[PDB]
Amino acid sequence: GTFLNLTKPLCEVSSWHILSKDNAIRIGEDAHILVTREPYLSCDPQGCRMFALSQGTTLRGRHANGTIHDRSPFRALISWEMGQAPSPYNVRVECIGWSSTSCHDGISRMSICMSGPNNNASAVVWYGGRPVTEIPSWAGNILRTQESECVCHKGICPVVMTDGPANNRAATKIIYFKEGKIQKIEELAGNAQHIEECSCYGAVGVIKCVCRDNWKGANRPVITIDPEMMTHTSKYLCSKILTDTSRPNDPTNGNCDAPITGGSPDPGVKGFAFLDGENSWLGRTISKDSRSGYEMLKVPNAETDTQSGPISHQVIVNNQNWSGYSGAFIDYWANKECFNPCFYVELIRGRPKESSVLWTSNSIVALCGSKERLGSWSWHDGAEIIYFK
Amino acid sequence: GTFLNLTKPLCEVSSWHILSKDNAIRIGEDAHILVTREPYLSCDPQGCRMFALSQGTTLRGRHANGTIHDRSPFRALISWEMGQAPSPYNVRVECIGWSSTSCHDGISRMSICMSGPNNNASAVVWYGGRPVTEIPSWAGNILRTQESECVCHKGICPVVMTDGPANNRAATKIIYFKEGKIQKIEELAGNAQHIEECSCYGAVGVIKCVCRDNWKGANRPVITIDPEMMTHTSKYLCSKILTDTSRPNDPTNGNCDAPITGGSPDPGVKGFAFLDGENSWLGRTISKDSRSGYEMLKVPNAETDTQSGPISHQVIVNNQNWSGYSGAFIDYWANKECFNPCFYVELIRGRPKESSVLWTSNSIVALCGSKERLGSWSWHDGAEIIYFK
Amino acid sequence: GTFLNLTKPLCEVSSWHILSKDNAIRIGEDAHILVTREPYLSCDPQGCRMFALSQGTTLRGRHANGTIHDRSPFRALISWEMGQAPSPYNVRVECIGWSSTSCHDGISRMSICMSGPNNNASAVVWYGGRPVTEIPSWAGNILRTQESECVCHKGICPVVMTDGPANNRAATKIIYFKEGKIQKIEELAGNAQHIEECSCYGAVGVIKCVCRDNWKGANRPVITIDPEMMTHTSKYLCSKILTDTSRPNDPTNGNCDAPITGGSPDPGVKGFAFLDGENSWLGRTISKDSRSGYEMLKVPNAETDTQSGPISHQVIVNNQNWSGYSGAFIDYWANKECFNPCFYVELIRGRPKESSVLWTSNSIVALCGSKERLGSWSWHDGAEIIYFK
Amino acid sequence: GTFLNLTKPLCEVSSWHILSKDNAIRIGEDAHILVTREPYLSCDPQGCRMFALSQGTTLRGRHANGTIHDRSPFRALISWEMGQAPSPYNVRVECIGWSSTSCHDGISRMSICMSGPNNNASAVVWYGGRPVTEIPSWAGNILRTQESECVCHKGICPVVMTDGPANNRAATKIIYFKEGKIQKIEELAGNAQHIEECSCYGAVGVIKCVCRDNWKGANRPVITIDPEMMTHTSKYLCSKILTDTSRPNDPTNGNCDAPITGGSPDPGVKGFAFLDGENSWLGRTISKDSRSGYEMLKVPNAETDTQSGPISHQVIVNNQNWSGYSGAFIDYWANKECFNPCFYVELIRGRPKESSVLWTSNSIVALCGSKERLGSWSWHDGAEIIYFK
Numbered sequence A, B, C, D: 001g002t003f004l005n006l007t008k009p010l011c012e013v014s015s016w017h018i019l020s021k022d023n024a025i026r027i028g029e030d031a032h033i034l035v036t037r038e039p040y041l042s043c044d045p046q047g048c049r050m051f052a053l054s055q056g057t058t059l060r061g062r063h064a065n066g067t068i069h070d071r072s073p074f075r076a077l078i079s080w081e082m083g084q085a086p087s088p089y090n091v092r093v094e095c096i097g098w099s100s101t102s103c104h105d106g107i108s109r110m111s112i113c114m115s116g117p118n119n120n121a122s123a124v125v126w127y128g129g130r131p132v133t134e135i136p137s138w139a140g141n142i143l144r145t146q147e148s149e150c151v152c153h154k155g156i157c158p159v160v161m162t163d164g165p166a167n168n169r170a171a172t173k174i175i176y177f178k179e180g181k182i183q184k185i186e187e188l189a190g191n192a193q194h195i196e197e198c199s200c201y202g203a204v205g206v207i208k209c210v211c212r213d214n215w216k217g218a219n220r221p222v223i224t225i226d227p228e229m230m231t232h233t234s235k236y237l238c239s240k241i242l243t244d245t246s247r248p249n250d251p252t253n254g255n256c257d258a259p260i261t262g263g264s265p266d267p268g269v270k271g272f273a274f275l276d277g278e279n280s281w282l283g284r285t286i287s288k289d290s291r292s293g294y295e296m297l298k299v300p301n302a303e304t305d306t307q308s309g310p311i312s313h314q315v316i317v318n319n320q321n322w323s324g325y326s327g328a329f330i331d332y333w334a335n336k337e338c339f340n341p342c343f344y345v346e347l348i349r350g351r352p353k354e355s356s357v358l359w360t361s362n363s364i365v366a367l368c369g370s371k372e373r374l375g376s377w378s379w380h381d382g383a384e385i386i387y388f389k
């Protein structure tokens, strides 16, 4: 192997084609499928894999009761072959904990998991399947990270982490790893007021992360990282098309510099966007209130134009179906002259929206860009909750 | 690896020997086995694998209810080690969708899946486990393909696709791929009036596909492809021995040029034939009305002689048992001086013929040619439907 | 790889040490374990594997009902990692049928399966995971073979096959394969009156098979094969210690030349012996009437001395527990200066001896020679039949 | 590969970070998970694996009834990918028996299992997946060994074994293996009065084992081995901090030379310690009476100072939860300039402490040293016993 260099531009995207879907909830109604949440995908030179935080129980198992809870000693980052559903029999345990990120640098995979009590959590950083670095909480309030893949360039893999309140100012850092070893640590700079759950991708030597402001903004923070100089900037997505949930109705003008407040009742959801001038696509839930539906909106110059709106759209999950977290990944090792945007949507089933069952879990759908104008339909979870009752 | 070249002649065949049987329905009565339909097999330099369209649920699972339906967002092309039954734990997800083909070019495998709504479907073409090409529907009516393996020669893999009505003239194209990239597109030419579900094999630089005319003919269309010139011809199987289902009684003379109409109530079923002069074998259901039984008939010069009839026969599935789709494959990488014909029969259980259960699925049997005169027995599915009730 | 040559002598054996046990019935009471019978083991340069004839259903499944029957289209030769129990998820399907043998020649594995109706069975011979030869029944009465491993020398792998009555004279042949291709066919010669289910091993250029005379003798036939000249001889085990089941009480003198009749009610069981002068060990059921218990008896010069008796013994399965078939194998690729005898015992549970359940299956235990004097205990199946009711 | 040489010093340790947790009992409530006990971990150049003694049944299976019993013909040493739970589908059977050890020498893995009746047990020593040596009982009373990993240096792997009473003087030997072959045998020397279940690790050419005196002492025996000279010494852990269970209250002074008696009602439990001057850490159950809770105590110079006490502590399992055996392992192939201490805790569920179920099993948690001061929480089993009733 050799270190991945982000030498290629982002592919042009006109629509989104289906990459994978695991149908985990449908299958797990009668097969041994682990309860999960916070899934993502990440690729390496050999192929792409699915990742998620296991809850340490199967879906039909009695221990699925109570899995709405986010943090327990029974969670772990698991990965598995793309397209299969996650079972106790087919998963690789990457690390133990309740918040994670992972990325392959071209040579080996780095995986990071936070675990422990709220006031004293710690991250363990793995590289090539072995633990190499440990990081104690710096602010004593749920040290946590991206919940989707990091990105590497010339051996350097930046990771965004937060420690502190979910509903007030917190302490976010960008940590630059090489072979899982810390090369540099930066405090968050820029205008983003609060950072959670960054979704990141790279092209032409730049890494861009689109995150979640859980404190104030319905517009999403955008962090731009130079992995060579190991420096960064942050701001908000300029477009009037707001993409967090909950959010108010889209205003006539967005704000690049400051959070746009409003929306009820959810303070936020992990999301993503691909920002490449005219070639810009924003994902968001269809509902402005709740994690239901999912749409992709092509919003030219969303990163700079406060009045930018959609010129095209594709429904990924219809608004009669539950969505959840969404994030970015790219197969940086594809046989293509450009890096092609991909994303996943977490399809959450169970609590709190479906409280007639005792559990919370999800399935996954993932799509990638196409230059063609492809037709579309809804890739919802597909399970009947009544079958679980 | 190196590109497969179709340099060898077809083996002479006097009878058929058992290659594989997965007993999926028997096993799936009490193990975690995926609901499938439209199975096939395809080989590569390392061995042969089974393929099918999953329905995204296990057989005993509650979501098996309703799996008579052909198209949903929960289907995917899966492959698995030949002889095992397909489980959530042992399958490779090749691509996502409800119509497929796959073939290995000697170096890597190309897999193609169509998905989406009837009026706006699209194909995604994968090569070496990564998506490389997308193709939008050209006629807005269920873009679809072979449901068995394609065949490659010097890196070129032709695939037959149809878009348009199932019960009227449609728009069929032959698309010539190399490394999953389109080299050439031809509109269907020749005398075949309608083309569905082509079953293809190759020898001495020729690829021959035997298909399903769902509009008019009980005789099967035959497409002959030159993968070097990337051109083709089409006609109907000449023999009076009619091989689609449903079909009328065999007439005194077949028709090479035009469909022979008649038969009730099914408009067609995927099938196959090996056409090599005197060395010609036609498969068909034993019933002329329904997908029950399966027989192989050696019909010398079936491709040219309108009065050709069987000189030998072998019952593969007796007429007291359900069959289904059938198709061709060859282990082009066998240590033999000739390419030996193989075929599979899909053994459909459940709806609509067995409507006392809520599901539809299948198991697989596969056989290959022998120069010996081997005895035979029925390789029916073997499950007791009462056990599922 | 390179062809195995049988250059080494047989190891001296004073007692037997535990090699593997799969506990398949215990585990299969509540896991997805295939119904099997006629198991064995066979090794290759990488390690050893377990083999058996699947019945194409799990043990707890409803289709286990009726698995006392020996021949169906739902059986297959399966292999799996030594020590695991056989599940739909972990087995390799070697070939399809209801009688088998398999052996590795140092380069690739040859596996053979007979299938079909009683009057028209056929063998398919596989090599390196691909079918290479087919053999039709020569006597029209259940063409069948060893049910344990064959043995190879310089690329030549002899296999003993029988076609004809189980209760009268039949037609047995020795077929000499190389890369699964027939090099020579011999009719059975010698004094053995009937041959079934040969258990074979090799050393110093000789292959010796100890078989089952189902027609007359309670003493076992012994076939000695020269795999270089491709010739053989046959006789009966000389010792007065009779080792088939059923058998009469051991007489004062055995018979090398002719069957010793008597015993009730079973006509025979597959068994084995290692015959190496003073270093000779005979296995047999403890009961003279039924397949219960298993004992190893060191009987010096059993192959020549009609008055030879045991000088030592080791109980493998106590006589309060069911046994079944037994056979020989050797890890010819071990890092040892001699080839060490190994054997397995099939531990049959269910019908006909335990007819309070509807099924018949087995588990496996396997042991190998030790020069030490090791203590012993009973390695019985260990399942409680009441748990299955 | 090349032989591991213990050239590196032990890493400095200030706290313990989470390495792995399998949540086997939680998962096994509704998945096919084997009943086990006596688990451990052991690494090789490729990674680390979990090991345990299977009971030859799944947890939910009816045969789990009675698994409190330690010795049966249905037990085996199994290994599996670190972090997964042990299932019939994912385990490697290392050897057959009811007491074990295993270690990798840098080239291949040696695994040893004892089996048989109490008065006539025997060990079989495997190397590279093949049996190579057998050892008969020397004292006729449950020949047995470490129940955690051995350690290798320049191809030499010492193993501590005991044969004789559990409640009186027994016969312990140190056996020095190379490629599974005995190089030397020593009778136990030193002041340790009784030796069971040694937990061993190596650094700078020394192997140190911390064991269980089941006869007299609540202080643990310490055996120090020179694997080059193949010699050893033994004594007791000097510290007043007593680490066996049961034990009396810690006295004002420990004893290096002799057992400190007292404690009720358990005669002992397998445990461990890392002894490296000021860098010394003792594990023990939190309860002095029973196998509940688990704490790590940094006790500088525990190996020499009879008045040494804890300067820091970390709770691994809180005292409201069951623990069990604990032992040492190190990833000797990590990319680190020092060998980093790791340990596991067996989390026993079921009998005898939870006798409202019929079974006994466990799950695993494993942690490794960190130079950081990391926060901590309890990594208890996490299953609800009520769900099993």
Ligand SMILES: *[C@@H]1O[C@H](CO)[C@@H](O[C@@H]2O[C@H](CO)[C@@H](O[C@@H]3O[C@H](CO[C@H]4O[C@H](CO[C@H]5O[C@H](CO)[C@@H](O)[C@H](O)[C@@H]5O)[C@@H](O)[C@H](O[C@H]5O[C@H](CO)[C@@H](O)[C@H](O)[C@@H]5O)[C@@H]4O)[C@@H](O)[C@H](O)[C@@H]3O)[C@H](O)[C@H]2NC(C)=O)[C@H](O)[C@H]1NC(C)=O
Pocket (backbone or CB within 6 Å): A014, A015, A016, A241, A250, A286, A295, A296, A297, A309, A310, A311, A312, A313, A314, A315, A373, A374, A375, A376, B119, B120
């Ligand atoms: C075969 O498949 C083809 C590809 O899938 C498909 O091609 C599609 O064709 C349609 C019709 O030509 C195109 O639709 C066009 O979309 C743009 C963008 O619309 C999006 O944004 C607008 C503006 O939203 C903002 O303003 C409104 C208030 O005005 C606010 O509510 C909103 O919050 C924003 O602030 C929005 O109004 C649109 O809303 C539609 O879609 C959403 C889901 O995203 C629905 O929830 C909603 O009910 C409504 O239906 C939308 O979000 C628009 O400006 C044009 O007028 C036109 O509608 C697609 O872009 C195009 N897709 C692609 C990828 O090419 C073919 O239609 C298909 N063929 C057939 C026969 O089905």
Ligand SMILES: *[C@@H]1O[C@H](CO)[C@@H](O[C@@H]2O[C@H](CO)[C@@H](O[C@@H]3O[C@H](CO[C@H]4O[C@H](CO[C@H]5O[C@H](CO)[C@@H](O)[C@H](O)[C@@H]5O)[C@@H](O)[C@H](O[C@H]5O[C@H](CO)[C@@H](O)[C@H](O)[C@@H]5O)[C@@H]4O)[C@@H](O)[C@H](O)[C@@H]3O)[C@H](O)[C@H]2NC(C)=O)[C@H](O)[C@H]1NC(C)=O
Pocket (backbone or CB within 6 Å): B014, B015, B016, B241, B250, B286, B295, B296, B297, B309, B310, B311, B312, B313, B314, B315, B373, B374, B375, B376, C119, C120
């Ligand atoms: C050991 O195994 C050997 C190999 O399996 C086996 O060898 C077989 O031996 C038999 C007997 O010699 C041979 O049978 C011969 O078959 C030919 C061809 O028959 C097939 O086609 C005819 C004609 O069909 C057309 O015309 C009729 C009206 O006339 C229409 O109905 C039909 O639709 C067509 O238009 C057909 O009549 C035959 O029908 C038989 O078989 C079908 C199943 O395919 C049944 O459904 C039907 O009821 C009937 O039984 C058949 O389709 C025929 O012309 C000869 O007269 C002769 O019957 C096999 O070819 C031969 N097989 C091989 C591969 O060698 C041995 O028999 C076996 N030994 C034992 C003891 O079992």
Ligand SMILES: *[C@@H]1O[C@H](CO)[C@@H](O[C@@H]2O[C@H](CO)[C@@H](O[C@@H]3O[C@H](CO[C@H]4O[C@H](CO[C@H]5O[C@H](CO)[C@@H](O)[C@H](O)[C@@H]5O)[C@@H](O)[C@H](O[C@H]5O[C@H](CO)[C@@H](O)[C@H](O)[C@@H]5O)[C@@H]4O)[C@@H](O)[C@H](O)[C@@H]3O)[C@H](O)[C@H]2NC(C)=O)[C@H](O)[C@H]1NC(C)=O
Pocket (backbone or CB within 6 Å): C014, C015, C016, C241, C250, C286, C295, C296, C297, C309, C310, C311, C312, C313, C314, C315, C373, C374, C375, C376, D119, D120
């Ligand atoms: C620690 O483990 C050690 C190894 O496991 C173990 O060592 C064993 O020690 C015993 C006692 O010294 C030895 O036993 C000896 O065995 C020989 C051979 O006996 C076998 O054959 C005779 C003869 O059988 C023939 O004749 C009789 C009529 O006379 C017929 O019934 C029969 O069908 C034959 O024609 C037979 O009588 C023996 O029968 C015994 O064993 C069978 C099971 O095989 C039982 O079913 C039966 O009830 C009876 O118990 C036997 O088959 C014998 O001649 C000697 O007299 C002596 O009995 C073992 O050989 C030896 N094993 C090895 C491998 O070294 C230690 O005993 C053990 N220590 C402890 C404390 O347990």
Ligand SMILES: *[C@@H]1O[C@H](CO)[C@@H](O[C@@H]2O[C@H](CO)[C@@H](O[C@@H]3O[C@H](CO[C@H]4O[C@H](CO[C@H]5O[C@H](CO)[C@@H](O)[C@H](O)[C@@H]5O)[C@@H](O)[C@H](O[C@H]5O[C@H](CO)[C@@H](O)[C@H](O)[C@@H]5O)[C@@H]4O)[C@@H](O)[C@H](O)[C@@H]3O)[C@H](O)[C@H]2NC(C)=O)[C@H](O)[C@H]1NC(C)=O
Pocket (backbone or CB within 6 Å): A119, A120, D014, D015, D016, D241, D250, D286, D295, D296, D297, D309, D310, D311, D312, D313, D314, D315, D373, D374, D375, D376
């Ligand atoms: C973020 O995480 C940090 C790391 O996890 C954590 O750092 C910890 O901080 C605490 C507080 O500063 C430190 O605690 C210190 O521990 C030492 C050692 O205490 C241990 O040993 C003593 C002595 O035991 C002996 O004597 C007593 C009688 O005196 C006997 O009972 C006993 O059997 C022995 O003979 C013992 O008293 C302590 O007991 C405590 O802990 C045990 C569990 O181990 C409990 O069961 C018991 O109830 C009691 O709570 C203990 O065993 C001590 O001398 C100091 O006084 C001080 O208590 C930790 O060492 C330190 N850990 C590390 C690894 O750095 C932070 O606290 C955390 N931050 C927050 C906000 O949570």
Ligand SMILES: *[C@@H]1O[C@H](CO)[C@@H](O[C@@H]2O[C@H](CO)[C@@H](O[C@@H]3O[C@H](CO)[C@@H](O)[C@H](O)[C@@H]3O)[C@H](O)[C@H]2NC(C)=O)[C@H](O)[C@H]1NC(C)=O
Pocket (backbone or CB within 6 Å): A062, A065, A066, A358
């Ligand atoms: C799913 O998990 C929930 C949460 O643990 C279970 O509900 C809980 O059940 C327990 C046992 O009945 C209740 O405990 C009782 O609490 C009262 C006081 O609140 C106490 O007086 C009793 O002695 C007992 O401890 C508990 O309250 C209850 N919690 C809630 C939120 O309802 C539930 O049973 C689980 N469901 C299934 C199907 O497993």
Ligand SMILES: *[C@@H]1O[C@H](CO)[C@@H](O[C@@H]2O[C@H](CO)[C@@H](O[C@@H]3O[C@H](CO)[C@@H](O)[C@H](O)[C@@H]3O)[C@H](O)[C@H]2NC(C)=O)[C@H](O)[C@H]1NC(C)=O
Pocket (backbone or CB within 6 Å): B062, B065, B066, B358
């Ligand atoms: C297998 O799937 C079928 C099809 O979904 C299930 O049958 C359906 O069951 C639902 C719920 O009872 C029926 O819904 C009802 O429809 C009527 C109007 O038609 C409406 O008034 C009610 O409010 C309700 O929506 C539905 O009609 C029915 N469909 C059919 C074709 O019968 C069936 O229950 C499933 N079986 C099992 C065992 O899971």
Ligand SMILES: *[C@@H]1O[C@H](CO)[C@@H](O[C@@H]2O[C@H](CO)[C@@H](O[C@@H]3O[C@H](CO)[C@@H](O)[C@H](O)[C@@H]3O)[C@H](O)[C@H]2NC(C)=O)[C@H](O)[C@H]1NC(C)=O
Pocket (backbone or CB within 6 Å): C062, C065, C066, C358
């Ligand atoms: C296990 O398999 C056996 C053998 O198939 C099953 O027993 C069979 O059950 C069927 C259905 O009740 C019986 O069929 C009946 O036969 C009589 C004439 O003999 C006929 O008049 C009826 O119309 C019907 O066909 C069959 O006799 C019976 N066979 C035997 C040997 O008892 C059994 O039910 C299966 N058990 C389980 C639990 O699945």
Ligand SMILES: *[C@@H]1O[C@H](CO)[C@@H](O[C@@H]2O[C@H](CO)[C@@H](O[C@@H]3O[C@H](CO)[C@@H](O)[C@H](O)[C@@H]3O)[C@H](O)[C@H]2NC(C)=O)[C@H](O)[C@H]1NC(C)=O
Pocket (backbone or CB within 6 Å): D062, D065, D066, D358
């Ligand atoms: C779990 O395993 C235990 C131990 O094997 C089972 O308990 C045992 O059940 C058997 C059958 O009822 C009892 O056998 C009876 O023993 C008396 C004499 O003690 C005899 O007169 C009867 O003829 C019969 O043999 C046995 O005593 C009993 N043992 C104990 C310790 O209670 C138990 O049934 C199993 N539980 C489950 C749910 O599988």
Ligand SMILES: [Ca+2]
Pocket (backbone or CB within 6 Å): A212, A213, A214, A215, A216, A217, A218, A244, A245, A246, A267, A268, A269
């Ligand atoms: Ca927000």
Ligand SMILES: [Ca+2]
Pocket (backbone or CB within 6 Å): B212, B213, B214, B215, B216, B217, B218, B244, B245, B246, B267, B268, B269
């Ligand atoms: Ca038709």
Ligand SMILES: [Ca+2]
Pocket (backbone or CB within 6 Å): C212, C213, C214, C215, C216, C217, C218, C244, C245, C246, C267, C268, C269
């Ligand atoms: Ca006999």
Ligand SMILES: [Ca+2]
Pocket (backbone or CB within 6 Å): D212, D213, D214, D215, D216, D217, D218, D244, D245, D246, D267, D268, D269
């Ligand atoms: Ca003690």
